[PDB]
Design a binder for this molecule. Sequence first.
Ligand SMILES: [Cl-]
Ligand SMILES: [Mg+2]
Length: 171
Amino acid sequence: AKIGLFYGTQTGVTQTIAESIQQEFGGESIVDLNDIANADASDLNAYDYLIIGCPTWNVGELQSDWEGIYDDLDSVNFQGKKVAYFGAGDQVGYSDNFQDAMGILEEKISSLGSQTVGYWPIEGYDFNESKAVRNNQFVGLAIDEDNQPDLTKNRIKTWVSQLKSEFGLAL
Ligand SMILES: [Cl-]
Ligand SMILES: [Mg+2]
């Protein structure tokens, strides 16, 4: 596929979101769904367009599968790659750490020369601090199934439509 979606899941939520994102793009012909627990770093090298999915459920720590590959991200040539991000989190229970893991990953991958795409507005949320916020925007799509499960569908549809322009799929 044109787009490689790599996700780490903890409670299953990230996988569910990953499948919805794939569906909204057009299905398996357009987006490959890859569990990062099953991937080598070289698997990310094969895509010009990447979507990186990671939940935040333990403050200070990355999801275990992303933590295990984090140092090997250096073996990927990220130069020229367009990379989007999404994360599941709880903005009420983790108001000081909302979507931290998504921000940790974007910071690493952007430092390797990739171009972040898919910035997302913070105004639809209620939180105090986030490592994923740059210049009053999220680095990617923030999902909260605990507090805003009714918003997830239209957030994904809106974000994917925005990514199609940045990923050159728009007509
Ligand atoms: Cl999860
Ligand atoms: Mg390197």
